[PDB]
Amino acid sequence: KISDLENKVTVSAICRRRLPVIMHRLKMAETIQDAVKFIEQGHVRVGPNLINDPAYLVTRNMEDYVTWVDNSKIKKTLLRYRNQIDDFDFS
Amino acid sequence: KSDFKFSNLLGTVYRQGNITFSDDGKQLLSPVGNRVSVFDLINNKSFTFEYEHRKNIAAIDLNKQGTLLISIDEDGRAILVNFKARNVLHHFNFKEKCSAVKFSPDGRLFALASGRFLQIWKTPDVNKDRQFAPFVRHRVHAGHFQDITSLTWSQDSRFILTTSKDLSAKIWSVDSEEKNLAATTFNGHRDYVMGAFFSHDQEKIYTVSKDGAVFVWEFTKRKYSWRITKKHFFYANQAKVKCVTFHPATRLLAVGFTSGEFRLYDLPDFTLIQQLSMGQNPVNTVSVNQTGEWLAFGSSKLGQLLVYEWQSESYILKQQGHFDSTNSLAYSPDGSRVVTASEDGKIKVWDITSGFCLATFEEHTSSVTAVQFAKRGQVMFSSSLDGTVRAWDLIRYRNFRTFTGTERIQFNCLAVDPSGEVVCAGSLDNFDIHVWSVQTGQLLDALSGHEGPVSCLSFSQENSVLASASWDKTIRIWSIFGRSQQVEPIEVYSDVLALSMRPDGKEVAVSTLKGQISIFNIEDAKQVGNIDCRKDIISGRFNQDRFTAKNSERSKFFTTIHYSFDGMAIVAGGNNNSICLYDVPNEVLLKRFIVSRNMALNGTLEFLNMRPEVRVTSVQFSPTANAFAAASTEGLLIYSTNDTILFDPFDLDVDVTPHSTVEALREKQFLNALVMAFRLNEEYLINKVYEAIPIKEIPLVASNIPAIYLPRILKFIGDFAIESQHIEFNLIWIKALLSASGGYINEHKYLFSTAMRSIQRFIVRVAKEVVNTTTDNKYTYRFLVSTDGSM
Amino acid sequence: YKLDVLSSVHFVPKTISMEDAQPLYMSNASSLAPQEI
Amino acid sequence: CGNFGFIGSSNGSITIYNMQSGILRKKYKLHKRAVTGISLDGMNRKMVSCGLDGIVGFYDFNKSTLLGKLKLDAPITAMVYHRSSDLFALALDDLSIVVIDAVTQRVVRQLWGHSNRITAFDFSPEGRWIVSASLDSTIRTWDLPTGGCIDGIIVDNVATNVKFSPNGDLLATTHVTGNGICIWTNRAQFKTVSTRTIDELNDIDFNTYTSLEQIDKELLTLSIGPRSKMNTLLHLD
Amino acid sequence: AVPSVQTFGKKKSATAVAHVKAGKGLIKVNGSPITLVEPEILRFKVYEPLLLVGLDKFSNIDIRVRVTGGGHVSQVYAIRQAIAKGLVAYHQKYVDEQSKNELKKAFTSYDRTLLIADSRRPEPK
Amino acid sequence: KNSKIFSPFRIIGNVSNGVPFATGTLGSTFYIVTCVGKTFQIYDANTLHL
Amino acid sequence: DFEVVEEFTPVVLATPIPEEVQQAQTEIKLFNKWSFEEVEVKDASLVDYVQVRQPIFVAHTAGRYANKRFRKAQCPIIERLTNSLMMNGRNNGKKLKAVRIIKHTLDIINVLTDQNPIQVVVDAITNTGPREDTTRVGGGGAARRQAVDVSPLRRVNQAIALLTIGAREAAFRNIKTIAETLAEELINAAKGSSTSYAIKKKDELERVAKSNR
Amino acid sequence: KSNKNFELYETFMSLLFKAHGDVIHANNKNQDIASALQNWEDVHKKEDRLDDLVKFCMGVAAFVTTA
Amino acid sequence: ILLMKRCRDWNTNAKTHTIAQRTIRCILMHHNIAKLSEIPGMVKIVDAIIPYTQRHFTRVDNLVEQSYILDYALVEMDKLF
Amino acid sequence: KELVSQKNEELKLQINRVKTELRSALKSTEDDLGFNVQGLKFVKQQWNLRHN
């Protein structure tokens, strides 16, 4: 799309790159109301480094690697409910 | 062996504060960031002070004896330093905000702009010992209505001019016994008065305003007191006065405006001597020499520094740092210059013997990633996020190839084989390893193989294998030459960053994301060992946190690794403020350095009761200098070592004393004296016996030297011959040494590698330059005599 | 600037004249490729 | 590295415990009387035991063998280790101080001089000085490069213990009386001090050597100073 | 409420889940003790995880290992992988880290296929 | 007797000996002043820094 | 004198481990019977191509040893022996059968001639592997031979192939089987008797090399 | 003559030559400047011993490092 | 100036090069310098002459620098016996 | 590494002869090259000193 960037890129798309709504579309949380609680508690990394500010825009080439850190309570209880908690690599 | 002091600071040549010359013009000292730096402008060198304020630095000076500096931060943490030996001396806290400090010209007293008041203190002494409470407050003055914006001292120690943001410029006497002389308050300027200076004969007082007014107060008639005899105007259009100074001994007033311009005047007639402009961003501070010749400027927005000789209108140094960017570095494999590559998108080529940016390279649009030299260090490469990698040489200082993918994809790392033919680069969002031929700037192959994004590359130096490493937890040994393209994967436990390779080409060190270092053999694929490094790095408690200060895995990994050229020590740094260095055969930390203490930087300390954040992105060892560079958020950090004060000998016993060495020297057993001093391994004794060996037996001693002190002797002769003067004596020593023991180092190539780099960059940096200069002198003589032109 | 500050990890800050950023002081067209000359 | 505690007993048994759980890890048993000095390198590669039968054991500790057993000819009260220069100093009971290095195992410096029991060692952080306090109420500063004294402070009270700062500016000495710990500031890092034996060539005295301007006439020099001056002078047009 | 830890190991298709907890020595494969492993000639292939380091590092623990799937030799490789990485995980998070990476150095010095598996499939020449 | 390397600096960890410490007012900050063995120290009485 | 104690309680696990196993925990012997210590290669030029510096427990270390050029010269010599022995039409992938017959083979070379069986197999390899060799030179069509030498990897490979195929030819269908015939052929090749198929083929190859050198 | 500040005297002489050595070339072979720089080169021509030394040393250093 | 054009043609090689350098040597040491300066248009070819002969100067300098390995072989063969 | 270990006085005399005559030839042609380039740079710089 070349000249019709006048009409589509709006608030509902430029906020769709946000880490809470990308988290909710990745189904890592129930809703935004506790997705912001998780990524403010500092459980969620993207790439290699942890990210804490809940206004971050995950880019195109980083949406694939926005995953929970090792050694965290939510990763531990996820692997516990799936009952696959391979406890060699910390969790 | 790991006595790494913090020696230099390349990059960010001035950040914030007021540049000051020394008592003479030889040493220019500047308020860089947290610390300060000192540039020796005649014996052209640089160092950076070892102390560190707790916040950003705000005002510097040293007294007129040149033996005592005080720096003072943005809040009142005064550091007082004995200047002539770089020891921190006293740690005072003034109680509130400081604006500018100024030593009196005699050195007894100093004065301080504490907001609306004015502080007057007497200094402690430097000849007597360390006191406890050394600051005696002399007097405060509280006559203003708003904050003081600057101070100037009289030539004698009797009067100060306090110029403020309230429109008064007030003259204040230093002692109350003669207070009835002049406590007056010159008003009159339209808006803020930003300077006030005495003349040489202290009967005329100039005051310079914000809008560009210069008022000449004089004591004439209409008892009769302080009228205004002359008014001058600067007539900049919308450029108010941003900084001023006035050297009285030659009547020179330097005024820098708020639009990058500065003018400078011969004041009592007010003629415009010289007017020019630095940039589109305001010059923040000025300073003069004691003798009027040198004249230095500091612009704070871009962070650049000028010095100026205005008799013959020429400069001595003209540097410019960056604004909060240093993304990678690389040495040269002859360790004489260092490329840094800055996240604003530009390359700088510093030289470590100087401290000067001898070259910018402004080509890239977007951010830069990494740099990498090849072929002894006169061809370098640079990879951007713009979508290309590109070559440069360091002879012509120009591009010659711009390698690109046909897809507009950014890159993250790159490397280049030693036989300077192929160049590999590693991207982020097409999962591949591209290789280009550097002979013809085409894409050779899209060398795929991974499942995810690659993060760090290296070519070897003995077989030139590639060792890629990617976030699929996999490193990947590639052999791309000779009909094969052999692949071999090695699989690490966790995610992978930060590869480096040992310079003998037998093993490869890799960091992980699970806070570990591993080393892998590459003719095999088994490990050797893993150094666990997730308990010995202290990341900082952010100001944007709910969690604790230690358990949060913020930067509990190592974003960059490098080996050392002997092969044992590994230096490693991450996004946290801890530089570690280890050795491989014992898997223990040699040392851990905190990099900075700026609480302006957010994640710095551990117990703080968006933001700039402390980070270290690339660390490398020197090929010869026995220093290592870090590329922090501040700039280049140079931790150097020495053969000095650490007394680390090598198998001494009861009889070997420096007295015994010098008596064996005077009894002329020169080889026994040399080994008797090298067993001791002390700096002055080695230098003394090495100079005092005469010339007619250099073959005898260099032939009958042992076979175990030879790398130490070669390393010392190189690192003394770089900054020595006796170049024919050094060349005689090296000729005798590698004529008598030439085959042995060739059969023991690797443990002489950090010495044979030194005496080869001793030759190609000073000796070959001197020899081609006398070559040109011989040829110009031979021409000017052999031909005949009589017009 | 506003885009990569929104979408980056670390922060991003941003008469007669002269210039502090140059290729070299010394060479100055006495270092040219002989093929180009 | 902080993962190992070493304990030396009164029957020669030196026990090496792991630290962060408290279980025993290994137990060396070499001496037959009590053990007075234990230390270990930074590399976790050479440990030294030093027992007052008079013997010093050099162990590997990455294997569990020993590889050196030096005997001496006095009992030993105390030991101290300078890890940055692989050296370690021993009190003896013929009142000598013997400093020996943990690689080549020679008896590298034999320091006489004291007249009673010595009771405090410390190595300066640069490894150039040791300070020893002794029950004839003296504090002597030995420079082990020359193997000789520098000064002896005759302090009125007997100095019990002497330590240094990690960055060598402070002496922390406690004496036999006085509740507090006395602090001394050196003038070490402010200027070089002499190396002259006291009782009751100036280059090697003051531990520095300036470079002479030339060796002789037929040996060339360069400009005594910078190196970019030549290039600036050749290209300054 | 006892200190337990659980690890996984797998060669080709066999899977071995190992529960290491504070016990008194016993080591079980599907209930049956470690002395009785089925193919009878790779019993030392399943022994050498608990033979490189000494039985005194197994005096305090007890291991119950369920194993499904895979053939004979893939099962016994899965059991040796589960035993080794379960022992190093238990020593990672219940006793000292120096003992942990000492065990890890010993296993990766014998052969690192005792700990992690080359689980990435082939090369398209 | 007299030294040449180490000048004595400050007895630390000692706040009194048994001599009656005195007090006084430096304007705002009340200061107490104590005796320790050979030297004397001065403490503030708001923060008890010295 | 010197003493180091590490364990203090008598360690006995709750499952009874056999006494030979907890004896083998001190030093790894092959098949819990044969020490890889005191095994030296009496010949030079085949060290670092045989590999008897790693005490394994059983010749089934199934790591990737073939996806490089020279990295099939580091898996141990008896594992290369049983893997070269495993192959014919009647058996491929019968490696536990190959391991059990190499177990019987080295057991009975112990019960006959006790040096130690890995020492016997190593100097059997060194005496077996040929040293000069012939190749077909082109010459346009003339059947002229030419003399070359052999790298140590080729010597070790052809040695294990000659031993295995000699035991195959010696118990194809006659009275004994592959285990005891590998035992007898390997002790003949270890002694150097020139009665085994291996040294017969080595002497034949070196004889034709010597002839048309 | 005295072998001190050798690079500085060489760059002084080359500065002389490329600054106003044109008059030297022009009225070359006058007796005064001819004998003046003749004895200058009689002293200067001894100063290729370090030329021979560096052409030794750089070649042997490169040889014993690489091959 | 025709022979100088031929010399500038010959100079940019490595085989036809010493011939050009000795030709320009014989001209330069057997003519007048003001004549060679005020021959019309004879700077537009010597400015192309000088970088090629500078490159050859550094190349023959590097080759005569590399020629000292025979001196090293001589001192080692003397040190042998 | 074998040329060093050889023992031949004729060969080392031959090496000395080849060495000295080759270095004489190379220093001669470098003399020609350097004299030419300095004379030519003088010619250009005085032309520019005339009418740059």
Give the integer Cα–Cα distance in Å for B32 and B46. 13
CA E54 distance to own-chain centroid: 14
Q: What angle do helix axes I17-29 and I2-11 make, rounded to 10 degrees? A: 140
* Secondary structure of residue B705 in the 3-state scheme: coil
Structure's resolution in angstroms: 4.0
CB G45 within 8 A of CB G131: no
* Secondary structure of residue B500 in the 3-state scheme: strand
Name residue, tokens 């050779």. Answer: B444
* Secondary structure of residue A79 in the 3-state scheme: helix
* Secondary structure of residue B77 in the 3-state scheme: strand
Query: Of E85, C12, I41, D146, which Cα lies nearest the Cα of B345?
Result: C12
What are the beta bridge partners of residue D29? D13
Kindly list the residues from chain E whose CB atom is less than 8 angstroms away from the CB atom of residue A85.
6
Angle at D116 between CA D112 and CA D119, to 5 degrees: 90
CB B422 within 8 A of CB B437: yes
Gyration radius of chain D over CA positions:
23
| Closest residue on chain D to C27 (Cα) | D235
Kindly list the residues from chain B whose CB atom is less than 8 angstroms away from the CB atom of residue G63.
none
Please tell me the total number of residues recorded for chain C in this structure: 37
Give the integer Cα–Cα distance in Å for I5 and D107. 81
Tokens of I38: 């005020």
Give the integer Cα–Cα distance in Å for B656 and D110. 12
Strands B474-479 and B466-470: antiparallel
CB atoms within 10 A of CB A52: 20
| Closest residue on chain F to D193 (Cα) | F5
In chain H, count of helices (H) and strands (E)? Answer: 4, 0
Q: What angle do helix axes G178-191 and G197-211 make, rounded to 10 degrees? A: 50
Please tell me the total number of residues recorded for chain D in this structure: 237
Secondary structure string (H, E, C) spanning B640-695:
ECCCCCCCCCCCCCCCCCHHHHHHHHHCCCHHHHHHHHHHHCCHHHHHHHHHHCCC
Instruction: State the DSSP code for C17.
Output: B
CB B645 within 8 A of CB D128: yes
H or E element in which residue B9 lies: none
* Secondary structure of residue G114 in the 3-state scheme: coil
I52 lies within 8 A of chain C by CB? yes
Domains of chain G: 8-213 (1.10.455.10)
Instruction: State the DSSP code for B248.
Output: T
Classify the C-alpha dihedral D68-D72-D76-D78 as positive or negative: negative
CB H22 within 8 A of CB J49: yes
Give the integer Cα–Cα distance in Å for B52 and B35. 5
* Secondary structure of residue B52 in the 3-state scheme: coil
Query: Of B673, B579, B621, B41, which Cα lies nearest the Cα of B318?
Result: B41
Q: How was it solved?
A: cryo-EM
Are the Cβ atoms of A60 and B546 closer than 8 angstroms? no
Give the integer Cα–Cα distance in Å for I74 and I69. 8
Give the integer Cα–Cα distance in Å for B632 and B616. 4
| Closest residue on chain B to H29 (Cα) | B785
DSSP D110-170: EE----S-EEEEEE-TTSSEEEEEETTTEEEEEETTTTEEEEEEE-SSPEEEEEE-SSTTE
B127 lies within 8 A of chain J by CB? no
Are the Cβ atoms of I55 and C34 closer than 8 angstroms? yes
Classify the C-alpha dihedral E111-E116-E120-E121 as positive or negative: positive
Tokens of B306: 């000028």
J50 lies within 8 A of chain B by CB? no
Kindly list the residues from chain B whose CB atom is less than 8 angstroms away from the CB atom of residue H18.
780
Q: Nearest CB to C24: which of B278, B320, B359?
A: B359
Instruction: State the DSSP code for B73.
Output: E
Tokens of B722: 């770089």
Residue A36, Cβ density class (10 Å: 0-12 exposed, 13-18 middle, ≥19 buried): middle
CB B563 within 8 A of CB B500: yes
Domains of chain E: 1-125 (3.30.230.10)
Kindly list the residues from chain F whose CB atom is less than 8 angstroms away from the CB atom of residue D151.
3-5
Instruction: State the DSSP code for B763.
Output: I
Closest Cα in chain B, distance from residue C13 (Å): 7
Strand segments, DSSP code E, in B440-537 are 443-447, 454-456, 466-470, 474-479, 486-491, 499-501, 507-511, 516-521, 527-532
D182 lies within 8 A of chain G by CB? no
Kindly list the residues from chain J whose CB atom is less than 8 angstroms away from the CB atom of residue H25.
42
Tokens of B4: 């790494």
Task: List all residues of chain D from 13 to 72 with a beta carbon under 8 Å from chain B.
Answer: 42-45, 62
CB B763 within 8 A of CB B717: no
CB H57 within 8 A of CB B763: yes
Give the integer Cα–Cα distance in Å for G153 and G49. 6
| Closest residue on chain I to J44 (Cα) | I43
CB atoms within 10 A of CB G22: 16
At B686, the amino acid letter reads: I
DSSP D9-76: -SSSEEEEEESSS--EEEEEE--SS-EEEEEE-TTS--EEEEETTTEEEEE-SSSS-EEEEEE-SS--
F25 lies within 8 A of chain D by CB? no
Q: Nearest CB to B491: which of E101, E111, E116?
A: E116
Task: Tell which of A70, A75, A89 to mutate to test the B interface (max B CBs under 10 Å).
Answer: A70
Query: CB neighbours of B714 closer than 8 A, spacing ≥ 6?
Result: B737, B752, B755, B756, B758, B759
Query: Of B135, B160, B123, B163, which Cα lies nearest the Cα of B147?
Result: B163
Are the Cβ atoms of C11 and B323 closer than 8 angstroms? no
CB A53 within 8 A of CB B610: yes
DSSP F1-50: ---SSEEEEEEES----SS--EEEEETTEEEEEEEETTEEEEEESSS---
Angle at A72 between CA A66 and CA A77, to 5 degrees: 100
| Closest residue on chain J to B784 (Cα) | J39
CB B528 within 8 A of CB B519: yes
Strands D170-175 and D159-164: antiparallel
Give the integer Cα–Cα distance in Å for D69 and D51. 11
Give the integer Cα–Cα distance in Å for D142 and B778. 58
Are the Cβ atoms of B552 and A42 closer than 8 angstroms? yes
CA D56 distance to own-chain centroid: 17
Give the integer Cα–Cα distance in Å for B54 and B71. 12
Q: Nearest CB to A86: which of E7, E88, E92?
A: E7
- Exposure b/e, B661-686, CB count within 10 A at least 16 = b: bbebbeeeebbbbbbbbbebbbbbbb
A49 lies within 8 A of chain B by CB? yes
Kindly list the residues from chain E whose CB atom is less than 8 angstroms away from the CB atom of residue B492.
116
Please give the biggest Cα pair distance in chain D. 82
Q: What are phi and psi of B170, to 5 degrees?
A: -110, 140
Name residue, tokens 């199934």. Answer: G62
Q: Nearest CB to E44: which of G11, G32, G100?
A: G32
Phi-psi region of A72 (alpha: psi -120 to 50; beta: other; left: phi over 0): beta
Tokens of D233: 């002078």
Give the integer Cα–Cα distance in Å for G116 and A60. 65
CA J41, J45, J47, J51: dihedral to nearest 10 degrees? 160
Are the Cβ atoms of E96 and D20 closer than 8 angstroms? yes
* Secondary structure of residue A39 in the 3-state scheme: helix
Query: Of B234, B248, B165, which Cα lies nearest the Cα of B205?
Result: B248
Kindly list the residues from chain A whose CB atom is less than 8 angstroms away from the CB atom of residue E6.
85-87
Closest Cα in chain I, distance from residue J33 (Å): 6
CB I18 within 8 A of CB J29: yes
| Closest residue on chain F to B131 (Cα) | F9
Are the Cβ atoms of A55 and C6 closer than 8 angstroms? yes
Residue E101, Cβ density class (10 Å: 0-12 exposed, 13-18 middle, ≥19 buried): buried
Kindly list the residues from chain G whose CB atom is less than 8 angstroms away from the CB atom of residue E51.
21, 24-25, 28, 57
Give the integer Cα–Cα distance in Å for B556 and B525. 27
Strand segments, DSSP code E, in B376-463 are 379-384, 388-393, 402-404, 411-416, 422-427, 433-437, 443-447, 454-456
Strands B560-563 and B569-573: antiparallel
Query: CB neighbours of B248 closer than 8 A, spacing ≥ 6?
Result: B155, B197, B198, B199, B200
Name residue, tokens 């130096």. Answer: B461
Interface of C with B (CB under 8 A): 10-18, 20-25, 27, 31-33
Query: Of E1, E8, E4, E2, which Cα lies nearest the Cα of E68?
Result: E8
- Exposure b/e, B213-228, CB count within 10 A at least 16 = b: bbbbbeeeeeeeeeee
Query: Of B199, B180, B283, which Cα lies nearest the Cα of B207?
Result: B199
Give the integer Cα–Cα distance in Å for B775 and C1. 54
Q: Nearest CB to J23: which of I37, I61, I67?
A: I67
Phi-psi region of E28 (alpha: psi -120 to 50; beta: other; left: phi over 0): beta
Query: Of F37, F43, F46, which Cα lies nearest the Cα of F14?
Result: F37
Cα distances (angstroms) measured from residue B155 to each of A83, B108, B394? 82, 13, 49
CB I71 within 8 A of CB H56: yes
At B2, the amino acid letter reads: S
* Secondary structure of residue B487 in the 3-state scheme: strand
CB B163 within 8 A of CB B194: yes
Closest Cα in chain H, distance from residue D212 (Å): 12
Task: Tell which of I7, I45, I64 to mutate to test the J interface (max J CBs under 10 Å).
Answer: I64
Please tell me the total number of residues recorded for chain H in this structure: 67
For B612, what's the count of Cα atoms within 13 Å in the CB-facing half-sphere? 19
Are the Cβ atoms of G14 and E23 closer than 8 angstroms? yes
Query: CB neighbours of G174 closer than 8 A, spacing ≥ 6?
Result: none
